[PDB]
């Protein structure tokens, strides 16, 4: 999961190519949910990347900690929020028992689980890691709503060279038994003579299939929002799944 080059050599570049509004709205949603859980709030960010959300959460008074399977992400996150709040650790290793009030997994981290069996294992570990009444926020990929185009992002190079850096990206459902998606990334920095291609296999990229899996993992309540706006799921390619553990 954390071994893909996108999250290692290109970890900092991953951040630069993520639209700012995407970060601001989803992070605000998380902080809103933390408030609705009371004070203090113990939060685990599963796949925290460079730790932007952990910073916002900790600045808001949340007892936020994170895990990521990428060594380069952990290093970047620890530089932002210190060493004790971030751990190199796979979501498949989660073994806490009731330690958190809110578990968050944004930006499709959960689909790096190995198939449905892997997803169910991780969701059950997340379920066990939450207190009774605790909640989870999982951002998923609904592959059937993926853009039907190869997308492109251009940004200036290390010394301001215009369009020196390009990413092309393609998301398509795979013809598999279980709903899954091939997420293809191409990275190029022309001035530095860098060219990377990489094909991420993402498992259970279907909002209805994911919700049913969340139920099977033990969550009493499961809600799918179209976005941080909290509208009902309709056409979003990256809806938000909110789950609650029974009392
Ligand atoms: N099995 C796994 N366990 C923990 N983290 C994983 C993982 N597989 C992939 N990841 C991590 O999940 C991230 C997916 S992209 C991260 C962006 C996301 N918006 C965020 O919260 O930061 C990467 O940092 C990658 O290293």
Author numbering: -1 to 245
Show sentences the authors wrote:
Crocagins (1 and 2)24 are very small, intriguing RiPPs that possess a tetracyclic ring system, which consists of a pyrroloindoline fused to a tetrahydropyrimidinone moiety. Here we use in vitro experiments to demonstrate that three proteins, CgnB, CgnC and CgnE, are sufficient for the production of the hallmark tetracyclic crocagin core from the precursor peptide CgnA. We further show that the hydrolase CgnD liberates the crocagin core scaffold, which is subsequently N-methylated by CgnL. The crystal structures of the homologues CgnB and CgnE reveal them to be the founding members of a peptide-binding protein family and allow us to rationalize their distinct functions.
Based on sequence alignments, CgnL, named ‘MT’ in the original crocagin publication, was the likely candidate. Indeed, incubation of 4a and 4b with CgnL and S-adenosylmethionine led to the formation of 5a ([M]+ calculated, 509.2395; observed, 509.2391; Δ = –0.8 ppm) and the –2 Da 5b ([M]+ calculated, 507.2238; observed, 507.2239; Δ = 0.2 ppm; Fig. 4c and Supplementary Fig. 21). The mass increase of +14 Da suggested methylation and thus the production of des-carbamoyl 1 and 2. The crystal structure of CgnL in complex with S-adenosylhomocysteine was determined to a resolution of 1.96 Å and appeared monomeric, which was consistent with the closest structural homologues of CgnL identified in a Dali search. The overall shape of CgnL was typical for class I S-adenosylmethionine-dependent methyltransferases with a Rossman fold. The electron density for S-adenosylhomocysteine was unambiguous as expected for a well-coordinated ligand.
